[PDB]
Design a binder for this molecule. Sequence first.
Ligand code: CA
Length: 318
Amino acid sequence: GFPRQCGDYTVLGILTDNQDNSKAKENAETTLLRHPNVACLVGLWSQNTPMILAGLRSSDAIGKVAVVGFDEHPDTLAGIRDQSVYGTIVQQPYAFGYRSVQWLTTMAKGGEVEVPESGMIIIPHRSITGANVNEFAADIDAIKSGKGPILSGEQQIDGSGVRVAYITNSLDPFWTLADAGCKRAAEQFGCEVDVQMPSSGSIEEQKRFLESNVAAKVDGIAISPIDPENQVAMINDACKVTPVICQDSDAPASRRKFYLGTSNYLAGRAAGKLIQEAIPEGGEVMLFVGKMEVLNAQERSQGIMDELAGKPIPAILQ
Ligand SMILES: [Ca+2]
């Protein structure tokens, strides 16, 4: 129940808008009006921070309340640059593609990939603030012009003769950065990567990619399954002949070797840290999201509150 005391912070509630932009803006406006002491507004989904800023502008309150968000909507980055948004937490699709190619090429060459018993490798979020937002935009520019960073540093891997496949779940812009990551790793390691995108986002399209990769005898496959419960068989058939890993979305019931993805819970803890840096003295916090029935909204808000409360992480590391 709300309000909830989290250390020196009071989470007043989680306001839902069902992705209606004008309702998201209204929620921000009524929050400012009914809670004159509110200190930070937090947008849990990509659109919420732009509508928080819209509500602050209508209330003449830009800069009077701190703002923290998720993702890199252009209005969110503009707000970071003009200091009305303290920072935002973004995913790293480029590292999804790059590391998938890196780890599949390493296994194809006999090397080992350290994977925990959970079978999950967490690709780190990125925290963007006013202090590093120009470094972020420069990184994105470099990536788009085909000169993205070599995440593997000095580590040499001879991937010539290795052929791997990288299967997305759609033609979303998220996959354009991952595609650049695949091609940068392939150039770095000398391997060949087939980036395969299901144009209409159906499992039947992914099934034909999987069967083509088996017929081509690829050395490894990374896939973001569209409907994991109903793709266990087709993934297992590929696993019989070649290593399959999951990326971005997981099929934990299948024979896939491991999963790499984002931890929305740890992304929430990172946003909790941005809140703490935006208002070190504490105060009232309001969260905003489309709906709370979605898993990533539950994980992001729970991570925020656990971080503000200083909740100790029951963790395994070895
Ligand atoms: Ca600036």
